Amino acid sequence: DPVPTGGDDPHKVAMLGLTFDDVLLLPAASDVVPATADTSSQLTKKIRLKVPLVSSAMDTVTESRMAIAMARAGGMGVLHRNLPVAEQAGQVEMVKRSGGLLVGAAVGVGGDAWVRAMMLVDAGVDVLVVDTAHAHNRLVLDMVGKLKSEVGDRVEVVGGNVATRSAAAALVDAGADAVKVGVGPGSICTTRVVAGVGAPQITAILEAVAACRPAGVPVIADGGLQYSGDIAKALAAGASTAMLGSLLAGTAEAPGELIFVNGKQYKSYRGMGSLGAMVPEGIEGRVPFRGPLSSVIHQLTGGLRAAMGYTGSPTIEVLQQAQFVRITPAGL
Amino acid sequence: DPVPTGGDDPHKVAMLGLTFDDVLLLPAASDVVPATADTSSQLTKKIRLKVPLVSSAMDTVTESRMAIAMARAGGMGVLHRNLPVAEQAGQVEMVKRSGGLLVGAAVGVGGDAWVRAMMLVDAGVDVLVVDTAHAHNRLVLDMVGKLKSEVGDRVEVVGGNVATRSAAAALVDAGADAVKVGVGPGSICTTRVVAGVGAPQITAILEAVAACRPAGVPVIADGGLQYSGDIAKALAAGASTAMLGSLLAGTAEAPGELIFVNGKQYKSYRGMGSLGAMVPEGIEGRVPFRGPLSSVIHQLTGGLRAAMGYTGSPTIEVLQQAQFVRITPAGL
Amino acid sequence: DPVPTGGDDPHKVAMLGLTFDDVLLLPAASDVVPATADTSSQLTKKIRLKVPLVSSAMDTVTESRMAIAMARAGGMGVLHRNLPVAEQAGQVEMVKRSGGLLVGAAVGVGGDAWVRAMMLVDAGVDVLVVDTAHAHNRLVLDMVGKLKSEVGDRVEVVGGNVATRSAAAALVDAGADAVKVGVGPGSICTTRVVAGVGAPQITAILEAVAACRPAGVPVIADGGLQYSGDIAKALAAGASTAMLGSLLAGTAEAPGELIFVNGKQYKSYRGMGSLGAMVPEGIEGRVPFRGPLSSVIHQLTGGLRAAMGYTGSPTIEVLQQAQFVRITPAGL
Amino acid sequence: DPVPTGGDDPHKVAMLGLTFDDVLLLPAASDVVPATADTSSQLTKKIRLKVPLVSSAMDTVTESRMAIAMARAGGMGVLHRNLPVAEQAGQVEMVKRSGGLLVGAAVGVGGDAWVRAMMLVDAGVDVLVVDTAHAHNRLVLDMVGKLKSEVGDRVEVVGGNVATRSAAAALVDAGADAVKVGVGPGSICTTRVVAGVGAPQITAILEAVAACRPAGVPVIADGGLQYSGDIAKALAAGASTAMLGSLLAGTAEAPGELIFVNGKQYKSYRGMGSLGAMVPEGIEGRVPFRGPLSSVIHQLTGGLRAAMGYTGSPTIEVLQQAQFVRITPAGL
Ligand SMILES: O=c1[nH]cnc2c1ncn2[C@@H]1O[C@H](COP(=O)(O)O)[C@@H](O)[C@H]1O
Ligand SMILES: O=c1[nH]cnc2c1ncn2[C@@H]1O[C@H](COP(=O)(O)O)[C@@H](O)[C@H]1O
Ligand SMILES: O=c1[nH]cnc2c1ncn2[C@@H]1O[C@H](COP(=O)(O)O)[C@@H](O)[C@H]1O
Ligand SMILES: O=c1[nH]cnc2c1ncn2[C@@H]1O[C@H](COP(=O)(O)O)[C@@H](O)[C@H]1O
Ligand SMILES: Cc1n[nH]c(C)c1S(=O)(=O)Nc1ccc2c[nH]nc2c1
Ligand SMILES: Cc1n[nH]c(C)c1S(=O)(=O)Nc1ccc2c[nH]nc2c1
Ligand SMILES: Cc1n[nH]c(C)c1S(=O)(=O)Nc1ccc2c[nH]nc2c1
């Protein structure tokens, strides 16, 4: 008996991938107005933010200025790692000396990454982020495991990115405090194009949460967020926080200079895997200038608070139990 | 066992949302020609219209001129509430003194809305419309309940908007005469975008009717109507009347001045939740000038009468029992 | 238990509608080359054509010139009825006197149509076509029934259009020799838009054939044919012949003058329900000039012969037993 | 009981067709980095390539220059047959004398093709490719069978193209060393348009592999490849090698001259069934100039190596066991 899509193997095409556009949040009974909502959520197992938003570790998104402004908004910024260890560790100190704010930093795998991690820890970093494209590799799982063995008492360790239930479960057993989710959904991403590899984030979050939540490990949604509604959809899918890159790249606190071409205003926004950021799995694009960060954060949270009012969710942990309605291509 | 879209929860993604474009009306045996059709239907439990159409309570759609012309066409207009109570109540009297025509008015929740409601009732209004974005909030359900307790004998009370079966059922038990349906499908709406919250109207109507019809409570379809066919689809989905905003905003009887820019003619059409109508959940757009109201109403009903001829529906109550055929994205 | 698309009624949304773009013909074992294929098929129960194509009864498609050229190509033309009976009957004689060619003519319902039918029969017409938008009306079923009772011995009677199994079955019992299928799929059609009524033709043909074929009554596919592949898809869906309008409107043998505007060449093509052809259910559009008819027919049949080579179909009656593969929106 | 898409026959619409855009590769546990991957795979039952890529047998894609450069890159080129046998056989010798490189050549069916095949074999060709549009014809199956009987000991025989399980199974029993798959998915192809015949390649590969792999016969994916990800998707679907035409037509080693029109650079790329290549089942289009071949091959393989890193596939034979996730139209 042939499978209705080809072959005799039902599990060849495992499941159906849903993205942010595929779904909409169902309104339920509510005692919650946007004003009274509690947007506080867990970034890690130890760290709680007033705003469940994080800025991406990219050289056109998050450094000193951004990382500080993000913390003061209630969230947190993660410093990118496309620069000498000495300066990145220096930026950590600049943030921490601005009022003891929360800050994160990105590291890869290997000796260079390990050395970098130690300097960051000494610099007083709060969260180390093992930044890889495919965290289901056994090298990444070891990088997380040993880091947690050495500095796990005073520093939080986060692994990513994953897109499957098994990958997230592997990170949990590795000792990760949080599991960042997103393989391919990025705006400047071309992993889906050059490798044909990816997983629609709504399904990706749902699968990852199914492995992390039973272990009490927070999940970070990374990439593919175009609007504030996507943030609410991500958290309702089970995620605890959301990492933004495209939505913050046009802000003034973000790296890259202004672009007054065409009479309009833009800012540079490139993937960390773009040819000019070093087979290129990223592109160097532009994003419309969106003014100060605080203005953008205020409206992203505003839409989030609205969704919590529609779904009758007083807290984020309740919003994570909302229900979706599936949307047909005519939904746009 | 994993759900084919993620997670182990089958009810996480509850149902599949259908919109007007997703469906088409199936032709059946007919003794009905468009000329002999009876378009009369129930707006409320007490009030019946010759034309099952209502103009939206928006400051660019329905005031004195529109509300009068709508009644004379067989339908009814609902006065918006973005203006002093004294003037809105005055517009009610202007309509009622033009031949004892039917008129509706919109109110919110709280003290201001209650005071406004009393002035409108004293002004001789026929239908009070509790105009909210999310009527499943217990504050709205109380606003409807107490209003019906005070002036329910001489004034009809309508609650909205809902998008789910449970929400509509709550409005029925609150004592509502009619339940208006539509969360997100509006043309100038951005609730789906900023909050990620909504429900495709065909499914939204079907679910709401499943709760209202057994209680004998009429259902109003609100928003998402681009063509006259959508009106027929809405009523066939179970709705008794349809509320139009975009289709009437370009009419001469509608507020907002003419726009002769580009050598073409347009009129202002903004959502009541747009930034300039006061986190903005609406936009200020333009719609093509469509001449007098009576001309538009005549052709909307004409398409409605045609659909009643194809489906063999002599009355609207029979049209509500028509069958749909589901359309693939290649349907456009 | 709620239906996954709304309501508690599984039959509210009866079935899923497939159009020509939704499907593709599956290649099978073949002893057939395009050269050796037999494109002959049944227009009616008595009449067989060398080419299973018919030109639409429209005032911008089929009159004297077209009806003659169609017959000489192996097919047949159906004269439209937007003109005095005296002239339409005269055009029948002009065709018949050009070598005893096959010709069809369109009539409506009522006294005028009955009188028209008699003049056409006296003029030596071979096929009378009851041309209506909704042939499931009992007035149409009577028009077919009595016509077949009066002149059924020497003239073939065809009813249309239908889109459902029950409608086609009603036409068969009325005594129809052929059942024309198509409600809404027309290019210049707006029935789907103004009335929200229609049925995707692949499904429409499949349902109609399921009622006609057991009774041995040929089925005509009408409207929605953009390419020659659609012709092969229509016949493989069970149809015996296909009626073309858009594909022949740009031909020189078709009514309407040349349009040299923009430096390109077009011809007038309007629906019989367009405002200028007399609530308008049609539009007045333009189609690219495609030269002589014989050139177009030669290439439409060429693509048809190719499909018969891929599917291993020596005759049209074998092609009607081909299998489809369903195509996702990424199919385009 | 009616089938939800029409008719009473469930097998009328056999299965659902998936293309490259419909699917994405699921990331799994990996010990594989792109550097350590082994891209080697089987072109035929006897011949193994270092790079699983083949250039299409088209007069705008693969001749002497291309066929040589392809072999030196690890793959192989297949010489087209739109030229005298004397010259095509001469091009084989030019390739073989450049270091004993691997080369293929295309033949049709009949006497001319048989004579051509013998000259090619004498010219020292390694792979004969029976190039037809529909290899499920019994004439093609005989052409493959007898060729393998005459020169099967010293020359490999490949049949194509197929799109169904039964067609591929027929080629295997005919004695084919490899089965090329692809009916309709070509970029310059119009078989889907003029004949309405085709089969989405992911499903087409899956069905063909289900018949070939049990017999140990390699499968070639032909046409429909827009990106390097599609190559990884094709092989993961079960294919052993992929035939490229559009991706290599813009290369300098490809036939057709440069096109400096519009200030940009293009090259001629026409189907072998295009009107100017001799009912036309092809078109004469243009493709952007992409520089040398080696540069393109290096990046196609680079994306392939990436996908092998994400899916934990050390070898191509392991990549063939990867799992897909189905993507909704919102996936783009
Ligand atoms: O170059 C790249 N290729 C693929 N993914 C990337 C690349 N650079 C950044 N990303 C991911 O995409 C996210 C940004 O997605 P966005 O917020 O939707 O723009 C980042 O936080 C990374 O997880
Ligand atoms: O600003 C807004 N945000 C969201 N929905 C709105 C807003 N303003 C009006 N609506 C709704 O949208 C309807 C109009 O939809 P339309 O007729 O499709 O233009 C109104 O009757 C309201 O129910
Ligand atoms: O004005 C109209 N409204 C709706 N359908 C029409 C109208 N005029 C013609 N048709 C139908 O559409 C067919 C032509 O479709 P086409 O060949 O796809 O252009 C005709 O043969 C009629 O069946
Ligand atoms: O003219 C044609 N009509 C249909 N298919 C063609 C034609 N010419 C080439 N093809 C096929 O399409 C493939 C190229 O597809 P592409 O690489 O996606 O451009 C070739 O290798 C052939 O299998
Ligand atoms: C190829 C690579 N190795 N290490 C990094 C960092 C990268 S990256 O620059 O390309 N970044 C990302 C980030 C998120 C992703 C999700 N899917 N793919 C991704 C790639
Ligand atoms: C946010 C708000 N509170 N009260 C009102 C009135 C509004 S509104 O201006 O935004 N109007 C609507 C009207 C219909 C809607 C359907 N979904 N969302 C909606 C919003
Ligand atoms: C409204 C009407 N009454 N009689 C005729 C003829 C018409 S028409 O001009 O509009 N023609 C058609 C023809 C085919 C159709 C398929 N669906 N709808 C259709 C309408």
Ligand SMILES: Cc1n[nH]c(C)c1S(=O)(=O)Nc1ccc2c[nH]nc2c1
């Ligand atoms: C019509 C014909 N006969 N022999 C050849 C060669 C051709 S072709 O030039 O058109 N080539 C192809 C090649 C691949 C195809 C996949 N589907 N259809 C195809 C056609």
